[PDB]
Design a protein around this ligand. Structure first.
Ligand SMILES: CC(=O)N[C@@H]1[C@@H](O)[C@H](O[C@@H]2O[C@H](CO[C@H]3O[C@H](CO[C@H]4O[C@H](CO)[C@@H](O)[C@H](O)[C@@H]4O)[C@@H](O)[C@H](O[C@H]4O[C@H](CO)[C@@H](O)[C@H](O)[C@@H]4O)[C@@H]3O)[C@@H](O)[C@H](O[C@H]3O[C@H](CO)[C@@H](O)[C@H](O)[C@@H]3O)[C@@H]2O)[C@@H](CO)O[C@H]1O
Length: 425
């Protein structure tokens, strides 16, 4: 049971503009674009004071569109809150009672979770809080565990993310979280096992999810978790270590920045991304075999060949997939190094895996006969070849889309086959 999480920077969704940035660039992705295979999304949102109205459209879309759509895909969502939030528990006396802890836990869940249609919570603790703070945080976390996390009896996640191994705020309430999200941006599996060992008294490796980042625009820090050769990048090392040592999985920060750099062009720009590194990391963490990856890649290349006019690029991609030695290479053969540089910008290995179950052989032979008829176009009547061409191009465009169903494939088979049976001469 592996997890793959992502911290979705809310202010980089299309529904936001001018929130938490000074860059006039338009955002390029929505939450619909989050790749398949990610089972936990952390709606990570920070709104500078005075911009709440600008971020409200995103929250509305999240509650009414993104969250239902991602729930339909089996994805659970969590909200990222500061650890200090837990410290704001109201109480009358010198220390909060059990009832006051419960009241503030329900308050947090209504404020940050239920009011957005989201499932769970994520506590971002990058501090060294004192014993006084930890009393309150322990009370609040234990109260929350009644409604979210393992001790709640529900599917709702309760996560604890940190970049260090300060145990005091975690040792007394460790069993209330589904897993700990360890941020190790710019570090490989050595820091991973170092932190695992330092967290051993309070956390088992199976509930330890290491995570890396992509370069954030205008960032003062410099975390290099991507690089070629792929097998020398921190992403490969951490993913393969997580799979090999049966860790809880892996997470990534700033999904929108997949494939970006700190170069002056990327540092001050918002650009689209083929999400190559994210999908590769999902596969590497899950332990996908190279045969599986190649099969999915070839299925995708076959179902887009009817709509793609670049036969040379098709041949090159197919050959590279066959000659690929790593999952990264199989994904890059289709996606390319960067957005637009590939035969496709949206190929998703997990989505394609889901599609594998649908048989396309009938549709494929029908489309091949249609292509043969279009090749001998001068030999039929135009009034009928034009029906065939319109139907074939429409079916090929639809077949190369993001997803399809068995019923749609049946309809397309019927349409192409009718168009074929109606050719004159
Ligand atoms: C999990 C993780 O990856 N954590 C951090 C990353 O956040 C951090 O990236 C940067 O994050 C800031 C946003 O961080 C602030 O808000 C976080 C989310 O909580 C907010 O919303 C909650 C719910 O409404 C509120 O309860 C909360 O108060 C807050 O408003 C919050 O978790 C975070 O707090 C952590 O860090 C502080 C110290 O800074 C610590 O005291 C806390 O205890 C806690 O651990 C912050 O309060 C985001 O604004 C940054 O993005 C800008 O800058 C980048 C360039 O760096 C631009 O690309 C981008 O366009 C924005 O202009 C950035 O994403 C990374 C380091 O970058 O480190 C991780 O560990």
């Amino acid at each position: 049971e592996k997890h793959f999480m992502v911290y979705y920077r809310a202010w980089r969704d299309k529904t936001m503009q001018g929130v938490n940035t000074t860059l006039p660039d338009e955002n390029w992705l929505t939450m619909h674009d989050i790749p398949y295979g990610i089972d936990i999304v952390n709606v990570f949102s920070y709104v500078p004071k005075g911009q709440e109205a600008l971020a409200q459209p995103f929250y509305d879309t999240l509650k009414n569109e993104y969250a239902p759509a991602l729930h339909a895909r089996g994805v659970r969502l969590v909200r990222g809150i500061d650890y200090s939030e837990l410290l704001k528990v109201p109480y009358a006396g010198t220390t909060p009672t059990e009832a006051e802890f419960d009241a503030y836990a329900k308050e947090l869940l209504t404020k940050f979770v239920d009011d957005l249609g989201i499932d769970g919570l994520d506590i971002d603790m990058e501090t060294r809080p004192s014993e006084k703070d930890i009393v309150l945080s322990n009370g609040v976390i234990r109260a929350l565990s009644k409604y979210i996390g393992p001790k709640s009896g529900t599917d709702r996640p309760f996560l604890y993310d940190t970049n260090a191994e300060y145990l005091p705020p975690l040792q007394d309430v460790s069993d209330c979280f589904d897993f700990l999200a360890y941020q190790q941006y710019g570090s490989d599996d050595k820091r991973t096992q170092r932190a695992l060992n330092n967290l051993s008294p309070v956390l088992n490796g199976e509930r330890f999810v290491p995570g890396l980042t992509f370069p954030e625009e205008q960032d003062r820090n410099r975390w290099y978790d991507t690089k070629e050769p792929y097998m020398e990048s921190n992403m490969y090392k951490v993913a393969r270590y997580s799979y090999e040592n049966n860790l809880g999985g892996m997470f990534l920060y700033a999904l929108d920045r997949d494939g970006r750099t700190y170069n002056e062009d990327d540092l001050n720009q918002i650009k689209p991304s083929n999400l190559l590194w994210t999908k590769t990391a999902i596969a590497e963490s899950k332990g996908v075999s190279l045969a599986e990856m190649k099969a999915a890649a070839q299925h995708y290349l076959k179902r887009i060949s009817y709509a793609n006019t670049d036969l040379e690029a098709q041949n090159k991609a197919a050959e590279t997939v066959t000659q690929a030695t790593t999952l990264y290479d199989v994904n890059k053969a289709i996606l390319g190094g960067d957005y637009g540089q590939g035969l496709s910008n949206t190929y998703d290995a997990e989505l394609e895996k889901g599609l594998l179950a649908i048989d396309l052989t009938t549709l494929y032979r029908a489309l091949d006969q249609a292509v043969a008829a279009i090749e001998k176009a001068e030999s039929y009547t135009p009034e009928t070849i034009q029906a065939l061409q319109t139907t074939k191009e429409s079916v090929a465009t639809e077949l190369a889309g993001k997803t399809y169903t068995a019923a749609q494939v049946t309809t397309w088979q019927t349409e192409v086959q009718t168009a074929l049976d109606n050719l004159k001469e």
